[PDB]
Amino acid sequence: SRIPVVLLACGSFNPITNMHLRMFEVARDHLHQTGMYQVIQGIISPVNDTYGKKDLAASHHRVAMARLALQTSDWIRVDPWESEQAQWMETVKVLRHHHSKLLRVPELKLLCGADVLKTFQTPNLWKDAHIQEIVEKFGLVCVGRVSHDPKGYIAESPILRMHQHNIHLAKEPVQNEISATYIRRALGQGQSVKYLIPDAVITYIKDHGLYT
Amino acid sequence: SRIPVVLLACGSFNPITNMHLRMFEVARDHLHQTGMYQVIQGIISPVNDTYGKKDLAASHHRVAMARLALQTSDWIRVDPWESEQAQWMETVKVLRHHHSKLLRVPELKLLCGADVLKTFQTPNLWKDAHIQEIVEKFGLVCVGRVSHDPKGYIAESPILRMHQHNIHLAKEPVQNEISATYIRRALGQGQSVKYLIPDAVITYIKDHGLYT
Amino acid sequence: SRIPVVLLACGSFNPITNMHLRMFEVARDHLHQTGMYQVIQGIISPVNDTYGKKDLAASHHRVAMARLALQTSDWIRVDPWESEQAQWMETVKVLRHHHSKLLAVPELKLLCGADVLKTFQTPNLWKDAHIQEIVEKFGLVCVGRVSHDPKGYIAESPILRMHQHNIHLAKEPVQNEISATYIRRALGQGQSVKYLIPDAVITYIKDHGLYTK
Amino acid sequence: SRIPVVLLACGSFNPITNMHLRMFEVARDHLHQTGMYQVIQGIISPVNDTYGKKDLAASHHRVAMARLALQTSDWIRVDPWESEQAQWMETVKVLRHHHSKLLAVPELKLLCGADVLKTFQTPNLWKDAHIQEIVEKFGLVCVGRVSHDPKGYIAESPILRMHQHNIHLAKEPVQNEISATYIRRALGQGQSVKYLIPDAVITYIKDHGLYTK
Numbered sequence A, B: 001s002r003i004p005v006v007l008l009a010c011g012s013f014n015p016i017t018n019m020h021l022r023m024f025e026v027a028r029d030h031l032h033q034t035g036m037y038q039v040i041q042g043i044i045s046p047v048n049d050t051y052g053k054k055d056l057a058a059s060h061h062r063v064a065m066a067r068l069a070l071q072t073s074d075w076i077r078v079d080p081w082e083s084e085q086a087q088w089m090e091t092v093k094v095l096r097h098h099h100s101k102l103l104r105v106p107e108l109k110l111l112c113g114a115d116v117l118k119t120f121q122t123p124n125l126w127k128d129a130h131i132q133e134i135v136e137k138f139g140l141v142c143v144g145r146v147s148h149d150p151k152g153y154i155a156e157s158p159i160l161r162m163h164q165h166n167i168h169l170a171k172e173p174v175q176n177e178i179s180a181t182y183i184r185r186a187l188g189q190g191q192s193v194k195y196l197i198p199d200a201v202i203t204y205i206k207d208h209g210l211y212t
Numbered sequence C, D: 001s002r003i004p005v006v007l008l009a010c011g012s013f014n015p016i017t018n019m020h021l022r023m024f025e026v027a028r029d030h031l032h033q034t035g036m037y038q039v040i041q042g043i044i045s046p047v048n049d050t051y052g053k054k055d056l057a058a059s060h061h062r063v064a065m066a067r068l069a070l071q072t073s074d075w076i077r078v079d080p081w082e083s084e085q086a087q088w089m090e091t092v093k094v095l096r097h098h099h100s101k102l103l104a105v106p107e108l109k110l111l112c113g114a115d116v117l118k119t120f121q122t123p124n125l126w127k128d129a130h131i132q133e134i135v136e137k138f139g140l141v142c143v144g145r146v147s148h149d150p151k152g153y154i155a156e157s158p159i160l161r162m163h164q165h166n167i168h169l170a171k172e173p174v175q176n177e178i179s180a181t182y183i184r185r186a187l188g189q190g191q192s193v194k195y196l197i198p199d200a201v202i203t204y205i206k207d208h209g210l211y212t213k
């Protein structure tokens, strides 16, 4: 029988885009392809407002847009927990929290784009103990992205290369490089982003005067 | 005052995708940017079933999917005329027909991706007299595409370079290279194409057993 | 053991670029990775000057630039035969010629980008019987390109599908979409194309005043 | 008339690739096209071996490969100073050093890809005062890269926005997303990387057994 899996994507989602969404679909299809898993749920967890130097739209707006984006999904949902904490939280702690909730046992895996794996290499960015826990205790499903070589990142990381059974590389056969930064700039300039992000998200953005 | 413009996109739309749709949005924003035009309507005209060697889904299905895709557009519509003719028709004749309908005067311009301009160079593909009429009588709005150099195609074409006032190059700042061929293959394999094409189009495809 | 293979690339090479050369390397590694082939040579065959609607630099120059580009390759050479003929020649005929030239005999395969595979679909472009002879009697090695889906092209063409075993899809996880059209325009504007095409080619272009506005 | 400019590129260059070199050419043409600058030199400065978490080839080798790659450039040279220091050094300090070296004086600007511009946003990575001195006292020339939106990065950073006149966005209408990570993995697998990095670099790599699995 197949192992039940829940995919957790942590990120800014400022705003959520069709690209972030496609990431779940490709990841799910990949895991199902292996024959060993049965993805049962997808979770979008927007980062807290105290994170980073960049000024994101308020967390309640990012959760609301993600929710609207997912109204048309029958397996992916947004979870505000992380954004509703008083402070930013390292991702491994978000995995721990969501794992606990699952026990109130499916496997919880972190879902991310290849650019994320590359940040594992950034000085003082991620704790090595955390990278190890993520791939050893939970699991990692990485979706390809132009200009990134996931296989190489894994091979060159002493930590990742020792936990490949728990790392799944899902290749993106389509060229999808739509930047959220670009989306925000286009909106600020009054230009269309239709067909780049869900219509409901576009409406919400207009209604609430976001990115202007 | 601004010159009223109607954009006509001729193609297979087998099926229509978010990329084909984004093409209209970018083209419209570009023309509006110049300050000289006011795009009043967009028209998707699916090619007839006798065209080419490739086996397309029946024209009534392609029109139906385009219609569903456009239900959420307030300015773009599908026009079945071309696909409802007994035989394939050169594009200039589709422009002539739609121009006549406009008179029962806005400017009618052909909308296409950069790869189209490149086919103008294919031996025995397009009649030179037709390429001239399209750019001289109507106009051409070209949206960028990875691997294509529209400025060079124009400069190297004796015909195009003499009619640049009627050619508008709209640059696509986003990397959007989602192939319809890939979409069809993914669907045939039972894989998701959600977030690549509109949900309503996906539903229609399933309902009518298309691309299987 | 491994069967010998010669790769033939027909195209404009106006001018030959690093991308065109990369195609040969990717294809060879791919064929070797299958374990059944041993690529022994690559051939660059610039198209005749009567070809198409686009003005190409003289074949004399395109052959020269390819030769100079290939001076640093130990397995790929340029062959001017096709360009020296009185007129343009269908690709199947160039394959036939080079096959005879080879005549326990190595297999000659057409090397091309995925885009060319898409052109097989173009009405009145390639004769169906030629596409058939190309994939059946020779073989095709196709290198991936952004925006193209070679697997789908093959599945949607009855001819390609039937002879798919003779079609080798090589994929390069790299994005190398550098068009020769852009190369020519940049050169005409006095901009650099260094590191996009070989230094020897840029030298020849400058020395012979090619691609000037 | 035009003010003289020296371009400084700090990075790993593990190994230097055609893409890294292309960056210099695109940036120079861009600056010249503005009409107010005259690029007189480019400098490749490989990072110190104590840098980061990733294992890099020895700086001795990275400097050597850059020198060999640049033998065919008449304006870009490699400078080992940064890599010869006892430890990693913040980029603003390397700029300060090379500026003093120049000391009616040319302007020294940091040359980088758009991705580096995005790293300015990374928490605890770049000191805000350094980002400020880099864009105000030196200048930044950024080359576009797929998936990045330099214009938005600048608009969203108060510091960058305030000194945007000293940030030059160069765009190359070409897709050249060839990662050095892929280059290293391919080399470790015995695959070709010819036409992705300079022939002289491949020779050095083979001769010194670099990037072996």
Ligand SMILES: Nc1ncnc2c1ncn2[C@@H]1O[C@H](COP(=O)(O)OP(=O)(O)OC[C@H]2O[C@@H]([n+]3cccc(C(=O)O)c3)[C@H](O)[C@@H]2O)[C@@H](O)[C@H]1O
Pocket (backbone or CB within 6 Å): A009, A010, A011, A012, A013, A014, A019, A020, A023, A047, A051, A089, A090, A091, A092, A111, A112, A113, A114, A115, A116, A125, A126, A127, A130, A143, A144, A145, A176, A177, A178, A180
């Ligand atoms: N075109 C595309 N194709 C495929 N994937 C794409 C994509 N665009 C975005 N993505 C993916 O979308 C996801 C979210 O993107 P985005 O909204 O930009 O989110 P982003 O800012 O990239 O997310 C940063 C996340 O990492 C966490 N973090 C950072 C640093 C250290 C630690 C720690 O625990 O020590 C944790 C942080 O708390 C936050 O959850 C990413 O996984 C990205 O790769």
Ligand SMILES: Nc1ncnc2c1ncn2[C@@H]1O[C@H](COP(=O)(O)OP(=O)(O)OC[C@H]2O[C@@H]([n+]3cccc(C(=O)O)c3)[C@H](O)[C@@H]2O)[C@@H](O)[C@H]1O
Pocket (backbone or CB within 6 Å): B009, B010, B011, B012, B013, B014, B019, B020, B023, B047, B051, B089, B090, B091, B092, B111, B112, B113, B114, B115, B116, B125, B126, B127, B130, B143, B144, B145, B176, B177, B178, B180
């Ligand atoms: N990712 C993307 N980014 C930007 N644009 C994109 C795109 N994907 C498709 N497109 C554009 O979508 C449009 C439709 O695409 P697709 O569905 O593939 O349609 P396609 O098969 O490329 O369309 C062929 C059209 O050209 C006409 N034609 C061909 C040859 C000769 C003559 C003549 O009159 O002599 C006429 C033909 O009747 C038909 O209307 C194209 O303009 C394409 O460039």
Ligand SMILES: Nc1ncnc2c1ncn2[C@@H]1O[C@H](COP(=O)(O)OP(=O)(O)OC[C@H]2O[C@@H]([n+]3cccc(C(=O)O)c3)[C@H](O)[C@@H]2O)[C@@H](O)[C@H]1O
Pocket (backbone or CB within 6 Å): C009, C010, C011, C012, C013, C014, C019, C020, C023, C047, C051, C089, C090, C091, C092, C111, C112, C113, C114, C115, C116, C125, C126, C127, C130, C143, C144, C145, C176, C177, C178, C180
């Ligand atoms: N970035 C890139 N990545 C991978 N491959 C890339 C590439 N850029 C070009 N290429 C490849 O380079 C090669 C040469 O490119 P280019 O210089 O543009 O050559 P191109 O003009 O595309 O070559 C046309 C060729 O097809 C032949 N043809 C056409 C139509 C009908 C028939 C017939 O026999 O009926 C024959 C014609 O005789 C000529 O040899 C192509 O195979 C192209 O796919």
Ligand SMILES: Nc1ncnc2c1ncn2[C@@H]1O[C@H](COP(=O)(O)OP(=O)(O)OC[C@H]2O[C@@H]([n+]3cccc(C(=O)O)c3)[C@H](O)[C@@H]2O)[C@@H](O)[C@H]1O
Pocket (backbone or CB within 6 Å): D009, D010, D011, D012, D013, D014, D019, D020, D023, D047, D051, D089, D090, D091, D092, D111, D112, D113, D114, D115, D116, D125, D126, D127, D130, D143, D144, D145, D176, D177, D178, D180
């Ligand atoms: N395809 C492509 N198109 C355009 N540009 C491309 C490229 N591939 C790489 N590049 C560019 O090549 C250059 C070198 O690449 P790579 O070899 O990967 O170098 P990389 O590891 O990205 O360089 C990091 C550099 O940033 C410095 N840094 C980092 C963090 C904090 C601080 C500080 O002072 O606080 C300084 C560090 O000392 C080092 O010099 C980069 O500018 C990159 O953007």
